[PDB]
């Protein structure tokens, strides 16, 4: 479950696949 996906926003983790667009801290969707 505690996986600390995370980001600044959507680019800060776009290499988990498209934009996967961001909570402010929190790349809830990288899965």
Do not use: A
């Not at 479950?1 to 929190?26: A, E, F, H, Q, W």
């Amino acid at each position: 479950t505690p996986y600390p996906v995370n980001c600044k926003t959507d680019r800060d983790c776009v290499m988990c696949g498209l934009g996967i667009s961001c909570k402010n801290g929190y790349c809830q969707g990288c899965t």
